[PDB]
Structure formats: C-alpha cells, structure tokens
Amino acid sequence: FEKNLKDVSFRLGSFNLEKVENPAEVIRELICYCLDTIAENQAKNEHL
Amino acid sequence: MEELEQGLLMQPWAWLQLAENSLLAKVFITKQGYALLVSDLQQVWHEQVDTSVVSQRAKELNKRLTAPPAAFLCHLDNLLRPLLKDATFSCDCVADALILRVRSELSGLPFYWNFHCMLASPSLVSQHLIRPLMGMSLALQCQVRELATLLHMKDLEIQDYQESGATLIRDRLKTEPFEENSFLEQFMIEKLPEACSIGDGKPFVMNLQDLYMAVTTQ
Amino acid sequence: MEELEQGLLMQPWAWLQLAENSLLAKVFITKQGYALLVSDLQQVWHEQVDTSVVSQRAKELNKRLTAPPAAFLCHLDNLLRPLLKEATFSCDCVADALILRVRSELSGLPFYWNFHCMLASPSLVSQHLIRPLMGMSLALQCQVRELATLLHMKDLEIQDYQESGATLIRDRLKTEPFEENSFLEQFMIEKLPEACSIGDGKPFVMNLQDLYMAVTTQ
C-alpha cells in the first residue's frame, strides 16, 4: 500500500505475504471479528 | 541554456529561513538546475548545478527513497524563492561550499539532505555583489542628489512663503531655512556610521533588495 | 598590509581613468605598498598589496625597464599624481587577475605596470566591496527615506502656506507634490543607464566619497 505523500505515490508498505494453508481459518477469524462488528456502532443503543 | 546565470543577474534576494544564522541564499530554481548565489553580504556562494546532478544528490542523500527526479525538481521549485522548500534550512558559512541543509522529514525514520553551493563564480558575484550593487549604489547616490534639488526647492518655497506673508503661527514646530548639506553633514556623522550595517543579508532585503530589483536590468 | 587595508577603508574610491571599462578603483597609495581595489563589474578583487608585491607585479610585465622595490613603489605613487591621486591607463577585463595595463612611460622606452588585484575570495569581498559599498548604499537608502519624509512634511507646510496665502513667487523651483516611489521610478528611467551601465563611475565617486569618508565604521 502506498501513501500519497509529497505529491508522489510513495511506497507506504511492501509486505511479502505467503499463501495460507487453508483460507477457512482466517475466514473463521473474519466471521468472529464479524461478531465484534455486530457489537460495535448501533445496538448498545438498547443498553444506554 | 545559461539561464542559471541570467537568472542570477536578476536574482531576487529572498531571506532564507534557518534555525541558524540566516543568510541571503537566493536562487533561480529552473527545470534544468539552478544557481544558488548565497549573498548574505558576508560570504558569496554559488550552486552551479543542473537538474540531474541535484536530483541525484537528493536521491543519494535520501537514504531509502523511491522518487522521480521531477519530484525533487518540484521540491527545488519550492525554493525558487528560497524561503522553505520542504525541513527548516541551515547554512554552513565556513568555506566556499555552503551546505544548505534541507531535512526531508514528514514524521518517519531519519533523513538528511543538503545543498552544496561550491565556490562562487566571481562574474556572478559581481552580478550580485559588484555590478548591480555598484549600479544601485550610484542610483541611490544620484537619487540623493535629485532629492538635494527637491529639498532645496521645498526649503526655498517655505522660506519665500514665510517672508512674503501668511507665515505659520506655530513658531515652535516650524523648521529653519533648510538645505541638503545640512542633512548630509549630520548624516555622515550619525546615520552613515550606523546605516553601515552589513548584517547577515537582512539589511539588503529590508532596504537594498527593492532598488536592486529596480536595477536588475544590467 | 592591514594599514593599507584600513586606509583603503577610509581613502575614497576613484575610477581608473582609462575610458575602457568600469574599473572603479579605491585609491590608497601610502608607503610600504598601496591599496588600489579595482572592480571591473564582472569580477571581485582586493588589491591589498605591499611594496614587495607591488614591485614584483610591476616587474612581472616589465622586460627591460626596472627599478628598486621602493623605487617602484614611489614611482607608482607618482603615477596616480597627475590623473588619479604616467597618466596612461588600460587593462584586460578578461583576465582573472585584474592586470591593469597601466603603460606609463618614464624613459621613452616601454614600461609595464599592472595594478594586479588579488582575486577576492567570498570572504575577502566583505572587507571593501561590501562593508563600505553596502554601508554607503544603506546610508543612501536611509537618506532617500529621510529626505522623502522631510519633503512630505515640508510640502505639507507649503500647502498650509497656499491655503493661508495664495501668493506665487517664482514658479521655477516650485516643487511638485513629492512621492518617494514616483521619484524612484522616474529615477529608474534616465539615471538607470547611468546606474546599471556604470561606464565611468565618476558620478559614483565625486558624490559618494563623502559617504566613504565615514563608512569605515564597520
């Protein structure tokens, strides 16, 4: 990812990823972060 | 195209912003380099560099940079009037090579970039320390002479008005019959010794830069 | 030496009377050398010479006609007597060292004198091309400002006199309503060729050596 600083799309990141063993695990991580979402910006309305 | 020296005869005197002793680093930044005739009226420098050499200087002095030469060319054009091109500037007024430090910093990891104004070309030294300075000195002097004529005419006007009637009644705030030499005699002993203030270039940009620009024609 | 440098700092400018280039020289010819700082409007110099280097410079262009060292020194002192302060002047503006081709004659056989000026380093220029020159220039700027405000207040008095008495007297030295900027602009028209193209520099000397007499404060 690049940060457009000093009028140039300067390289803000160059991250050497690696292929996951199985996307299912990070998908489960994504859907548990999804539960944190489900509790994040408009339902504790009920609470307060 | 030799516009660096041509831009160094009409070169506007811009007061460099420093954290140190501020000098009159003045330059005509071009797309093919520049000519930074640092003339603080104390020591004269000149950065006779093209765009390629200064751009590669910035790239090599930026430790880990992925930028085009045009990016630093615009960085330099920000110093076309050398006020601030970014960090804050810092001169090295020790030798014939002025190190005008420009720390390319935007809150990351260490950097250090600087200019290298090698020995000033005496021709362009005269183009901003002798020839148009000679010119603006003579211009100011004959200006003072024409002002001598103007003061003499106004003094004789006021006087010949006083003895011809309608003399002002506020005798305690009027002026005696004046003349230019009466001003010059007191100037030579009071102001001329103290108006002789070379300073770090700032006296030029407060009083001499304007009439210099008026005499940049040659 | 420093004695001759100081004398240069006090003894006034005086243009080399060669009618070839704007070789505005500062005359200080006193024993154990001299100080004739000559500027060609395209290079900076500082001829802070002593009698030994004076005589060796006199010999460097001479081939068959020579003299003792002090003989050379007092000869070149006499050289400026009829014309500056042997009344033949010339130079080569191209040379990096200002070889003032002063071909004064003594025997009817050629004699070669050069007011060889040492090339002024950017630290050397501050001694005399800046401190006295820019001192008198800032002094002239202050003179212009002070004379301008004095003209304005005297014209206020004048207008009070017409509004108290409508008498007209001479209409020959009747001043126009003075403006400092208008004065500067009207000066940058006709006297600018005098200023930018110095030519002789005689108007510079016989009108600014009064300022030079007391610009030596720095």
Curated annotation (Swiss-Prot), chain A:
Widely expressed. The chain holds residues 97 to 144 of 336 of the full protein. Phosphorylations by PRKDC at the C-terminus of XRCC4 and NHEJ1/XLF are highly redundant and regulate ability of the XRCC4-NHEJ1/XLF subcomplex to bridge DNA. Phosphorylation by PRKDC does not prevent interaction with NHEJ1/XLF but disrupts ability to bridge DNA and promotes detachment from DNA. Monoubiquitinated. Changing residue 3 to E: Abolished interaction with NHEJ1/XLF. Abolished ability to bridge DNA. Abolished ability to bridge DNA. Changing residue 10 to E: Abolished interaction with NHEJ1/XLF. This is DNA repair protein XRCC4. It is linked to Short stature, microcephaly, and endocrine dysfunction: A disease characterized by short stature and microcephaly apparent at birth, progressive postnatal growth failure, and endocrine dysfunction. In affected adults endocrine features include hypergonadotropic hypogonadism, multinodular goiter, and diabetes mellitus. Variable features observed in some patients are progressive ataxia, and lymphopenia or borderline leukopenia. It is found in: Nucleus; Chromosome. Belongs to the XRCC4-XLF family. XRCC4 subfamily. It comes from Homo sapiens (Human). Changing residue 44 to R: No change in sumoylation.
UniProtKB/Swiss-Prot annotation, chain B:
Residues 122-164 form a coiled coil. The keyword DNA repair applies. Changing residue 131 to A/N: Does not affect ability to participate in V(D)J recombination. Changing residue 133 to A: Does not affect ability to participate in V(D)J recombination. Belongs to the XRCC4-XLF family. XLF subfamily. Ubiquitously expressed. This is Non-homologous end-joining factor 1. Keywords: Chromosomal rearrangement, Chromosome, Coiled coil, Disease variant, DNA damage, DNA repair, DNA-binding, Nucleus, Phosphoprotein, SCID. The chain holds residues 1 to 224 of 299 of the full protein. GO terms for biological process: B cell differentiation; central nervous system development; double-strand break repair via nonhomologous end joining; immunoglobulin V(D)J recombination; positive regulation of ligase activity; response to ionizing radiation; T cell differentiation; telomere maintenance. GO terms for molecular function: DNA end binding; DNA polymerase binding. Changing residue 105 to A: Does not affect ability to repair double-strand breaks (DSBs). Does not affect interaction with XRCC4. Residues 1-129 are annotated as: Globular head. Changing residue 37 to A: Does not affect ability to participate in V(D)J recombination. It comes from Homo sapiens. The modification Phosphoserine is found at residues 126, 197. It comes from the Eukaryota. Changing residue 110 to D: Does not affect ability to participate in V(D)J recombination. Changing residue 113 to A: Abolished ability to participate in V(D)J recombination. Changing residue 41 to A: Does not affect ability to participate in V(D)J recombination. Changing residue 176 to A: Does not affect ability to participate in V(D)J recombination. The record marks 109 as: Leu-lock. It is linked to Immunodeficiency 124, severe combined: A form of severe combined immunodeficiency (SCID), a genetically and clinically heterogeneous group of rare congenital disorders characterized by impairment of both humoral and cell-mediated immunity, leukopenia and low or absent antibody levels. Patients with SCID present in infancy with recurrent, persistent infections by opportunistic organisms. The common characteristic of all types of SCID is absence of T-cell-mediated cellular immunity due to a defect in T- cell development. It is found in: Nucleus; Chromosome.
